[PDB]
């Protein structure tokens, strides 16, 4: 007999997954351009704020996962997260001229994203029995939904912003999130099997107060906390605490499972190298977006392409590459697995190097005309997108060889997200040592040349050690 179909609720989860990824990746395409053009931030300040936001959105999902586990259930937390992200995009759209509006909106979005990101996948995993064969198709479709939304959002938001200004771009992102929420809520009759909210826990009293009122207080104060954390650039102290906690978890883990201790060190070393990779990769939305805005010739068809659209190019490059390797998946995946892993990382770093070399070459030879060339930059972005398939999938495939691999996966994603984004913001300050003179193309040319050189240095070190340890 034919296999049973996917549980119909999947298609509503997919729908919200698209629209959330639409909103999140739309705002991300506009943000640094809005900070510079509308608000008149110096590049140092804009890059700092951007990287702080990009780290906190990788930090808060742990807290929202613990909240959905202990109190809310996954469905409630998904709904609340979508409401909060909608509210924050509406706040950002309604007033484009206060800066406090910006910080408040970003804090509200960070909270809603923290409630959403983990719990949407937990809710998808709740629909299947423990040995259901459909689960892999489910999660693959959810990943495809996220890729679709990541490709689609920078185009639509960029065009809407160009034609009507930043207000309508952010309003469009929020309307996307709201559409997705209404689609999800219309499917409620299919979710009746999923875990409801723990009414007994919420009606438990802790100190003088019922727990639900502590959630009300938290809903009020957490946006204030994150607003102050962003406005003062204090996110680094939180990131340091998170890193210290993760290090303690790993150390206790090293004691508890000494028969796997050396394997754990391999994962640690992977966490290091992948973090450095993502530092480079996170130049994509910050320094490279400013370079494209300022110094690339974007004229075509007697039209000018909005810089935000080039953020979609990366996503296309990732998705296409994902297909091709899937088209070419082959039984040669055997033998010295650790050496193969390290050579995959070396190849990804090499592709990242080539991307930065193409950007540096373009920014140098622009001097023949005065502006850089769209095709060489596009090629760099494409190569940088392709590089991403050889890092995180190989790392998670290596981690998932162990038990306890969910916590190590969480720690790996926390490092390569939050730490890599904060370090990317720190590194990007090297583009802006020449504040007094004004920005010039030579500063980006130096930055890209240095990034290429360091990438090839890391490639050489990895390859040399990996082969020297074979003999």
Author numbering: 1 to 471
Article, verbatim:
Proton-coupled Oligopeptide Transporters (POTs) of the Major Facilitator Superfamily (MFS) mediate the uptake of short di- and tripeptides in all phyla of life. The E. coli genome codes for four different POTs, known as Di- and tripeptide permeases A-D (DtpA-D). DtpA and B exhibit a prototypical substrate preference similar to the human PepT1 transporter, while DtpC and D have been classified as atypical POTs, because DtpC prefers dipeptides in particular those with a lysine residue in the second position. The DtpC structure revealed the expected and well-known MFS transporter fold, with twelve transmembrane helices (TMs) organized in two helical bundles and additional two TMs specific for the POT family (known as HA and HB domains).
DtpC in complex with the conformation specific nanobody 26 turned out to be more rigid and a significant fraction of the sample dimeric, allowing us to reconstruct DtpC to 2.7 Å resolution. Therefore, we performed a local refinement, focused on one copy of the membrane protein, which extended the resolution of the reconstruction to 2.7 Å and improved the accuracy of the atomic model for subsequent structural analysis. The peptide binding site of DtpC is exposed to the cytoplasmic side. Tight closure of both bundles above the binding site is mediated by a salt bridge between D43 (TM2, N-bundle) and R294 (TM7, C-bundle) and hydrogen bonds between H37 (TM1, N-bundle) and D293 (TM7) as well as R28 (TM1) and N421 (TM11, C-bundle). It displays an overall more acidic groove caused by the presence of the aspartate residue 392, conserved among atypical POTs. This observation, together with previous biochemical work allows us to hypothesize that the selectivity of DtpC for dipeptides with C-terminal lysine or arginine residues is caused by swapping a salt bridge between the recurrent carboxyl group of the peptide terminus and the transporter (R21Y mutation), to a side chain specific salt bridge with D392.
